[PDB]
């Protein structure tokens, strides 16, 4: 019929993009980085061990003050910890215990949580009555929520398991904009420092760079061999690192529109659950399924240290805004702080 | 300090008191992951009933012999389950409901059980198998609708097991068919999983009221086996 030529013209466009990328790749990042100083061996020890969660932890998020952190486990509790003194600050019971993500508002007045219930619950923390109460319940996603990030106190952005992302309006409770184009479950999203465009990695070996204002996909990046589990922006906002289940990490650059460096090793065969950069964009921390999270020197593509302690796979890994500590939450109901 | 820091310490202590009060409740209630197919009949199983936003809701709570069970019936996500199923690897058991009357889709069901059984995350989770719709299968195979060899040729040489227990005054053919279907699932179960997890097969209908009792008995067996494994006895 007439639809047969659609696929062939699409694959000429794909070949054109591929050859343009190949032409624009005159050299490699490894060639430029032959004569740079290696970071060396980074040995970090656990400074604190936050105990009190009953089940496996899936997500955590630091505060903008880099002192208070929210953690979400399968026992049905969202626990807000004071990391400096190990003291607990809040313990919010959740309606649905199957929570896969959590977020902490930049202003600190709100938190968010979502999971298999397909509802993003937004909780107020600075209420007059003192006791925390649910402030909003955003619904409209036909798949499970996998990640959510606060743009500000009024609007949030979430990614669901129905190959969609959504930018909401908390005051009203309606999807302000929707982002479509992925062919698989959108596992993770990362917001740029300017909060003008965010990236989303899905279960099709694809990470898409969107536009919160335009509402249309700006760029698409493939190259991974399997589904991508976690992504994060580079500190400057011009690049992002994607960790997938094919036991490798990849650094994508928006301007170059293609991969720069790949982090992989023969011994590691397990996938990457979480990934986050350091404060200077020189030390990449990635969590694996082999019960520990290797830290990668994300400029020469080699291991520069290994964390330990966790008796199960590490599910979440966050870094403070001032770069003073790294929190790792695994499936042993323990959240360690490293410095 | 002791002016505002003491308030933080006492708050943390009240939080911790509640977190211990409810740890007991959390650990004394069993969680169950219920799943099947659209034609399996899991909806009528969910009507045990001893104790919304038009999306997501998958909650069921029941209680027997003063112990509580939380049955979860995921019925809003997409077809690809390879990602959210990881959430259910700390569950006490996985209930698998299969319709044993539609032979056309029975192969799809065997493949489903297989992928669940060999999944990396659920390689330690026991499976309670409900061969639902036995009443329909009785007339499906008793009459001349279709014969199992049209989809499963191994039924030609199959013989009924010696340990099989029929029901009084009823034709052996349906017993042969149901034990055949059972054994295909049980072959898959025993192909892998040496002693980490086991499969409990049950013959159930849409009018059975003792399904909760079966789940309770299988849960006691699973818990006792886990306790014995911790002591390295079995």
């Amino acid at each position: 019929s007439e639809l047969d030529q659609l696929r062939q013209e699409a694959e000429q466009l794909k070949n054109q993009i591929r050859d343009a990328r190949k032409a624009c790749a005159d050299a490699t990042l490894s060639q430029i980085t032959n004569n740079i100083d290696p970071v060396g061996r980074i040995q970090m020890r656990t400074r604190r061990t936050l105990r009190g969660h009953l089940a496996k932890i899936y997500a955590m998020h630091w505060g903008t003050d880099s002192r208070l952190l929210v953690s979400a486990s399968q026992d049905g509790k969202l626990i807000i910890w004071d990391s400096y003194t190990t003291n607990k600050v809040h313990a919010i019971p959740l309606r649905s215990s199957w929570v896969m993500t959590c977020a902490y508002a930049p202003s600190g007045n709100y938190v968010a949580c979502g999971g298999l219930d397909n509802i993003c619950s937004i909780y107020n923390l600075k209420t007059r009555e003192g006791n925390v109460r649910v402030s909003r319940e955003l619904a409209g996603h036909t798949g499970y929520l996998s990640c959510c990030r606060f743009l500000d106190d009024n609007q949030i952005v979430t990614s669901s398991g129905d190959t969609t992302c959504a930018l909401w309006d908390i005051e009203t409770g309606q999807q302000t904009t929707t982002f479509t184009g992925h062919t698989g479950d959108v596992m993770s999203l990362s917001l740029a420092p300017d909060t003008r465009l965010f990236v989303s990695g899905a279960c099709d070996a694809s990470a898409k760079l969107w536009d919160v204002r335009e509402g249309m996909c700006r760029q698409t990046f493939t190259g991974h061999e399997s589904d991508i589990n976690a992504i994060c922006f580079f500190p400057n906002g011009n690049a992002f690192a994607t960790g997938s289940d094919d036991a490798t990490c990849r650094l994508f650059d928006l301007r170059a529109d293609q991969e720069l460096m790949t982090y992989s090793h023969d011994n590691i065969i397990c996938g990457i659950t979480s990934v986050s950069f350091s404060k200077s964009g020189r030390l990449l921390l990635a969590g694996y399924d082999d019960f520990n999270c290797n830290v990668w020197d994300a400029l020469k593509a080699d291991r520069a240290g290994v964390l330990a302690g966790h008796d199960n796979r590490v599910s979440c890994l966050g870094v403070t805004d001032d770069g003073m500590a790294v929190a790792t939450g695994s499936w042993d109901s323990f959240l360690k702080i490293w410095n | 300090l002791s002016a505002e820091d003491k308030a933080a310490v006492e708050r943390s202590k009240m939080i911790e008191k509640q977190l211990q009060k409810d740890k007991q409740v959390y650990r004394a209630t069993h969680r169950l992951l219920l799943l099947g197919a659209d034609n399996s009949g899991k909806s009528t199983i969910v009507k045990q009933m001893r104790i919304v936003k038009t999306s997501g809701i998958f909650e069921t709570k029941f209680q027997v012999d003063k112990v509580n069970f939380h049955m979860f019936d995921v019925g809003a996500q997409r077809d690809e389950r390879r990602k959210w199923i990881q959430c259910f690897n700390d569950v006490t058991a996985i209930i698998f409901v299969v319709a044993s009357s539609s032979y056309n889709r029975l192969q799809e069901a065997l493949n489903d059980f297989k992928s669940i059984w060999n999944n990396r995350w659920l390689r330690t989770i026991s499976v309670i198998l409900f061969l639902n719709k036995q009443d329909l299968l009785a007339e499906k195979v008793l009459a001349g609708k279709s014969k199992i060899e049209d989809y499963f040729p191994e039924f030609a040489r199959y013989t009924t097991p010696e340990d099989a227990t029929p029901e009084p005054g009823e034709d052996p053919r349906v017993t042969r068919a149901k034990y055949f279907i059972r054994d295909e699932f049980l072959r898959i179960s025993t192909a892998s999983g040496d002693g980490r997890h086991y499969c409990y097969p049950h013959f159930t209908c849409s009018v059975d009221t003792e399904n909760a009792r079966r789940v309770f008995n299988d849960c006691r067996d699973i818990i006792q086996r886990m306790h014995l494994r911790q002591y390295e006895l079995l």
Partner: nanobody
Amino acid sequence: QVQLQESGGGLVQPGGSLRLSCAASGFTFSNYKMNWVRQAPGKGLEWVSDISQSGASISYTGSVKGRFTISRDNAKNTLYLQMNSLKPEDTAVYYCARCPAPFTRDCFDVTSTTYAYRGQGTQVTVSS
């Protein structure tokens, strides 16, 4: 960018033998367990055959047991399905799938449309 391109097929008399070929590009072929599935008109996707990384573990659907054979060529990054004794009920689009997880024995791929690592299919049919 994964790409599973399949060839072969065509209208043949019942009882024939066809050698469907699957070429994989974009991933290490030897690290994944491959699969052959079929979509018949009217009904949905159904799993047919599988082959492990080395090629030792081989299982078939009972409806096509013994009649079809599967093989893997790691040197050419290719998958072969050789078909004997065709039947009118085997008229289906044949998809070549992968496994999402490498170095694993179990994965879910018999799912409906919008599965990433699956080919476009080849329409193979038998004469009356």
